[PDB]
């Protein structure tokens, strides 16, 4: 995508891992290739430290979807709140 903000899992892409026809469907900054593989670096450090460059899918999380005990388990700039749910933006690029 557009930038090192940009999050996007690109194990699941239309057609296999790391494919694409375009350049959301590669993570980071990376963008698509002429041969439809995605290309380039994500982000430098990848992963990101917590903030806008911290990408973490929240579905797969212990005790269900968007729940916490800590913030690395949150996405992005995202904190676990007291109550044991993810909180606040995550800050990620749109595209």
């Given amino acids: 995508g557009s ?5 996007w899992n690109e194990a699941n892409n239309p057609g296999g891992p790391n494919r694409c026809s ?4 590669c993570d980071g900054a990376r963008t ?7 290309q380039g670096t ?8 917590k903030g806008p460059t911290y990408c973490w899918d929240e579905a797969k999380n212990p005790g269900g979807p ?3 005990s800590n ?11 007291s109550s ?3 909180q606040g933006t995550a800050g990620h690029a749109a595209a």
């Fill in 32 to 38: 698509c290739s002429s041969s439809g593989f995605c």
């Fill in 3 to 7: 930038g090192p903000t940009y999050c």
């Fill in 22 to 25: 375009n350049n959301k469907q």
């Fill in 84 to 86: 044991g749910f993810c």
């Fill in 71 to 81: 913030s690395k388990q949150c996405d992005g700039a995202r904190t676990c709140s």
């Fill in 66 to 68: 968007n729940r916490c």
């Fill in 42 to 49: 994500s982000r430098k450090p990848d992963p990101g430290p």
